[PDB]
Design a protein around this ligand. Structure first.
Ligand code: VK1
Length: 135
């Protein structure tokens, strides 16, 4: 609830202040424009980028670090597929993933608290929704 908002703020500041600050991270800031890279979506079936993650964050898509890190890792996997494992683009995506990991670790204790309280809050909301519906 209130905890979901704090969690999303932390994630968004990790994205804007750490991941987007990686040198030359511009290729991963926004979705690829088909008019500029015409092959991209023929190759990349589950696209992902830092802007889309911010929008998912603002929609409170992420209740835990795990689903957040699923999407962050999709950025890296897509660079590996389209650009190659040894490419400079993939080197940059890997740095983006590492700074994300590093920053989450700094805030592990606080983020673990939030995830716990977010989950117990969502269970309280779901359990009462079902009790209200049958009663
Ligand atoms: C070479 S131009 C270009 N490349 C990009 N990447 C994506 C990562 O892999 C390599 C290459 C395909 C991404 C972009 C933009 S853009 N929206 N112009 O379309 C900002 C998103 N531009």
């Amino acid at each position: 609830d209130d905890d979901q908002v704090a969690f999303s703020f932390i994630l968004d500041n990790i994205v804007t202040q750490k991941m987007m600050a990686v040198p030359d991270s511009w290729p991963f800031h926004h979705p690829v424009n088909k008019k500029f890279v015409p092959d991209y979506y023929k190759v990349i079936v589950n696209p992902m980028d830092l802007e889309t993650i911010r929008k998912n964050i603002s929609k409170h898509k992420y209740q835990s670090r795990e689903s957040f890190l699923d999407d962050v890792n999709l950025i890296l996997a897509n660079s590996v597929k389209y650009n190659g494992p040894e490419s400079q683009y993939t080197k940059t995506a890997q740095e983006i993933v590492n700074v994300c990991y590093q920053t989450l670790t700094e805030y592990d204790e606080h983020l673990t608290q939030l995830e716990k309280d977010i989950c117990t809050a969502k269970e309280a909301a779901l359990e009462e929704a079902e009790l209200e519906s049958l009663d």
